[PDB]
Structure 1
């Protein structure tokens, strides 16, 4: 049925695939992105603490399962920097670095699989419960700040491998600080051959990227920079024999064959559930952003709920077949699009490229120096570091949107990467309250010879009507701004009804300008519980000094809430609800005349 085809998009979009103007483009794109996934795969695997094959596994399985369940047409899923950073934190925290290496690595990969499992389950859940609207609450400033912060950590991590130092470090509170000073202390312990192969690597990378960018096409497929750098460097470190002589650290044994089916031991569930929640939220945020970017630009739509289901299935399947959490990324996605990716056929093609390297090529990457992997990670990190361009832009336009960006970024650099995200998100939510908490109240008068009413301060043309004081709040009346409203009503109408009643009673036991306040509720989007209580109070007080309160403006839902909340018995009737300020004004004047006689 339509349910089965919507819960497995492949069965809808694959039959309609036109093999003539697309298949060429998707195969080019697949080869381009596979050439990119192999080096980065292994890189991002080291950054995460796991052995190097996990990057090849994470680059093979995820993109397939997403091709099946996925709605986006330009996203490439796989191992991406920030998630790898988060997985790494948890691994090295639950398995410190202290036969021995294989024992530690076995426990490491078990922690990884638990993280992948839980992160997939959370994402799957959210998508089944149709809570995919909550990925809108993750502002773009929030996510810019968080990814830029996380790229500062990932840059500092890869300095140690790039020089050849053997520094231990942490990801805990203020860890970047003592990590950078740790590297400044140990810079005399620099391996010189490791700095050699690092700088050689960067030179070849920038040369090939600039060359294939500026120089002539003469190619259906672009020049794969990272691949050829890994290849030249592994050959150089095998011939000149860097590993054993000069002491340059190399990638270990990469085992041949398909992944082994494994089981995430949920014995570690209470240790890792917190960081699995952070992985899951980061993954959704980044992947769905990218989905939406390319969907907007190419004139189609993604479903946020089906996207959550797809990413969750991909992680859970992967958890079973020896992977770590994948996600989409704007880099691979841009590369996949610029190469001429049209469907998820490109994802399937790229995964077959990683498959043939898992199976055959395999242990030729024995003599690959870890410095060439660190250099690849630093040149990929350009993307996220160029987002510092966004702190001035936000600054100019909206300063609360610039604070979301700064709080999140500082929170991520100079505390934890989990805590950064949490504090950022909280601040993001609070900015809506700070926008609505001192709203813009006004006293309105009639423009002469027109039956429109506008602010009397801002439009000096407008004159107040005799006997009728009209006031207009331009916000919801809720818990955040309701005391304020009642204050500003008593200050801009120039009357406090309880003080006036006190003076009247004092004078009567010893022995106001207006007869009608019209509240214009055109901009009251909603009222909550405190709101209805505050409006009850205002009406009761102004009944006591003998002033009718008419509402002129109320939307349907605000009238229904006022009614449930019991606003329509204490003096006010539903016949004091008018459509526009004018209709209330007329009615007010008329009652006054008919009562004069």
Structure 2
């Protein structure tokens, strides 16, 4: 049935796969992306505090399970920088660095699996409850700001490995500040051989990237830069024996064999639930952003809810099979597309390359220095840092879009990354109220010899109709802007009906221009409860000083809510609702005439 084929997209898109003009392309793309996943896999695993094999496990399992339940065709899932950074924060916070090393690593990976599990379950939940419309509310400025901030943290973290210092640091409030001054203090304790292999690594990386970009193809597959750099570095550090002689830190023992099946111990559920919620939201945001971009560019559509179910299932299975939360990335996805990726066959191919390295190659990466991994992370951070090109653009167009970007960026750098995201999302939602809370109110006049009405301050041509005052608000009337609307009505019509009633009563017990106000509700998108209360007030007041109030332009939903809210018994009838300002005006003049006689 259509439900089972929509809950397993693989069973629908796989039979249709034409093996002649696609298979070659997807195999090229898969080999290119596998060659890129291995080094980064290990690197991002260090950045999350886990042992190095978890990167390989996270590069193997997730892409498979996604290929099965996933709707996007150009996304590459795996271990990505910012999710790695969040997992790292949690692990070293629940497990300080102080037999002992293996005990610490066992508790570390238990925390990692609990994180993966809870994040998977949250993503899966949101997907089943059809709440995948809430990923719309994660603004593009919000995620730009967020990922740029996180790239500042990731850059600072990998400075220490890059010199060879042994600085402890935090990800807590203002931690960046004392972390960089910690690095400025301990720069005389710089290992020189570590700095050497770091700069050698960067030189080899920039040579290979520039060379294979500008120079002639002579290759169906581009040159895997990170892989050959990792290979050359481990060979050098094994021959010249850097580890024991010069004291250069290396990657530990990488074990041979498939992942062991594990169980995330939920004893830690109340400690890590906060960071698991942050991991789930960041995963959704970046995975679905990428999917949507490539889908638009290649002329197809992804389902947000099925993407949440896919990503959720991916992380839960990974949780059992010794992984840490995977997510879509723009860098791998760009590489998977530019290589000639057409389907999730490319993901399956990449995962087979990581698989053969998990089984066979394995402990050849013993003598790999940690400085080469830190350099790889930095050259891949280019992407996220070039998003500072967005703060001027936003500035030029919309200052509230600029502020969302700035608040999230500063939130992330100069407080926690979880707190940064929370503050950013709040401010993001507030900016809608801030746009609608002082709307654009106008008094309309008729253009001479035409049956259209427009603003009198903006179109001096338009004349007010005698006896008839027409006022138009250009916004919803809800709790934020209802007091303002009533005030601006009483200011631009130049009548306060309660002051006028007070004057008239006072004069009569001691012994206005218009007879009809027409509210143009064409632009009133919606009303809430406070809006309806305010409208009842306005109509009752102007009834008391003897002024009929007509509504000209209400949409169906506003009339229905005014009807529910009891607008239609305090003097106003549904015979006072007109279709256009003109019809209201005509009826008003006609009533005035037939009531004169």
TM-based fold match above 0.5: yes
Structure 2 partner of 1:413: 413
Task: State the SS of the aligned residue for 1:59.
Answer: helix
Q: Distance in 1 between matches of 2:565 and 2:261?
A: 59
Q: Distance in 1 between matches of 2:530 and 2:255?
A: 65
Task: State the SS of the aligned residue for 2:448.
Answer: coil
Q: Distance in 2 between matches of 1:162 and 1:217?
A: 33
- The C-alpha deviation readout for 1:550-586, integer Å capped at 9, x for no partner, is 0000000000000000000000000000000000000
- The C-alpha deviation readout for 1:417-440, integer Å capped at 9, x for no partner, is 000000000000000000000000
Q: CA deviation at 1:445?
A: 0.5
Q: Distance in 2 between matches of 1:566 and 1:213?
A: 70
- The C-alpha deviation readout for 1:279-333, integer Å capped at 9, x for no partner, is 0000000000000000000000000000000000000000000000000000000
Q: CA deviation at 1:99?
A: 0.3
- The C-alpha deviation readout for 1:45-85, integer Å capped at 9, x for no partner, is 00000000000000000000000000000000000000000
Q: CA deviation at 1:361?
A: 0.1
Q: CA deviation at 1:197?
A: 0.2
Q: CA deviation at 1:87?
A: 0.1
Q: CA deviation at 1:187?
A: 0.2
Task: State the SS of the aligned residue for 1:74.
Answer: coil
Task: State the SS of the aligned residue for 1:256.
Answer: coil
Q: CA deviation at 1:15?
A: 0.1
Structure 2 partner of 1:554: 554
Q: Distance in 2 between matches of 1:178 and 1:127?
A: 41
Residues 1:92 and 2:95 are matched in the alignment: no
Task: State the SS of the aligned residue for 2:476.
Answer: coil
Q: CA deviation at 1:360?
A: 0.1
Q: Distance in 1 between matches of 2:231 and 2:184?
A: 32
Q: CA deviation at 1:218?
A: 0.8
Q: Distance in 2 between matches of 1:211 and 1:568?
A: 76
- The C-alpha deviation readout for 1:512-541, integer Å capped at 9, x for no partner, is 000000000000000000000000000000
Q: Distance in 2 between matches of 1:396 and 1:172?
A: 33
Q: CA deviation at 1:336?
A: 0.1
Q: CA deviation at 1:407?
A: 0.1
Structure 1 partner of 2:126: 126
Q: CA deviation at 1:234?
A: 0.2
Q: Distance in 1 between matches of 2:482 and 2:512?
A: 23
- The C-alpha deviation readout for 1:180-220, integer Å capped at 9, x for no partner, is 00000000000000000000000000000000000011100
Q: CA deviation at 1:542?
A: 0.2
- The C-alpha deviation readout for 1:255-281, integer Å capped at 9, x for no partner, is 000000000000000000000000000
Q: Distance in 2 between matches of 1:257 and 1:293?
A: 37
Q: CA deviation at 1:451?
A: 0.3
Q: Distance in 2 between matches of 1:227 and 1:474?
A: 59
Q: CA deviation at 1:380?
A: 0.1
Q: CA deviation at 1:158?
A: 0.1
Q: CA deviation at 1:40?
A: 0.1
Q: Distance in 1 between matches of 2:329 and 2:55?
A: 15
Task: State the SS of the aligned residue for 2:441.
Answer: strand
Q: CA deviation at 1:510?
A: 0.7
Structure 1 partner of 2:245: 245
Structure 2 partner of 1:286: 286
Q: Which residues of structure 1 form unaligned runs of 5+?
A: none
Q: Distance in 2 between matches of 1:255 and 1:178?
A: 37
Q: CA deviation at 1:30?
A: 0.2
Task: State the SS of the aligned residue for 2:103.
Answer: helix
Structure 1 partner of 2:544: 544
Q: CA deviation at 1:226?
A: 0.1
Q: CA deviation at 1:485?
A: 0.1
Normalised by the size of structure 1, how large is the TM-score? Answer: 1.00
Q: Distance in 1 between matches of 2:547 and 2:509?
A: 22
Q: CA deviation at 1:112?
A: 0.0
Q: Distance in 2 between matches of 1:596 and 1:90?
A: 80
Task: State the SS of the aligned residue for 1:60.
Answer: helix
Equivalent residues in 2 for 1:118-517, closer than 5 Å: 118-517=118-517
Task: State the SS of the aligned residue for 1:170.
Answer: coil
Q: CA deviation at 1:474?
A: 0.1
- The C-alpha deviation readout for 1:355-401, integer Å capped at 9, x for no partner, is 00000000000000000000000000000000000000000000000
Q: Distance in 1 between matches of 2:347 and 2:478?
A: 49
- The C-alpha deviation readout for 1:465-517, integer Å capped at 9, x for no partner, is 00000000000000000000000000000000000000000000110000000
Q: Distance in 1 between matches of 2:257 and 2:332?
A: 25
- The C-alpha deviation readout for 1:92-150, integer Å capped at 9, x for no partner, is 00000000100000000000000000000000000000000000000000000000000
Q: CA deviation at 1:343?
A: 0.1
Q: Distance in 2 between matches of 1:153 and 1:529?
A: 46
Q: Distance in 2 between matches of 1:135 and 1:454?
A: 39
Runs of 4+ displaced beyond 6 Å = none
Q: Distance in 1 between matches of 2:432 and 2:377?
A: 37
Task: State the SS of the aligned residue for 1:301.
Answer: coil
Q: Distance in 2 between matches of 1:588 and 1:157?
A: 72
Normalised by the size of structure 2, how large is the TM-score? Answer: 1.00
Q: Distance in 1 between matches of 2:216 and 2:427?
A: 49
- The C-alpha deviation readout for 1:150-169, integer Å capped at 9, x for no partner, is 00000000000000000000
Q: Distance in 2 between matches of 1:390 and 1:216?
A: 33
Q: Distance in 2 between matches of 1:415 and 1:379?
A: 25
Task: State the SS of the aligned residue for 2:568.
Answer: coil
Q: Distance in 1 between matches of 2:11 and 2:186?
A: 57
Q: Distance in 2 between matches of 1:564 and 1:549?
A: 19
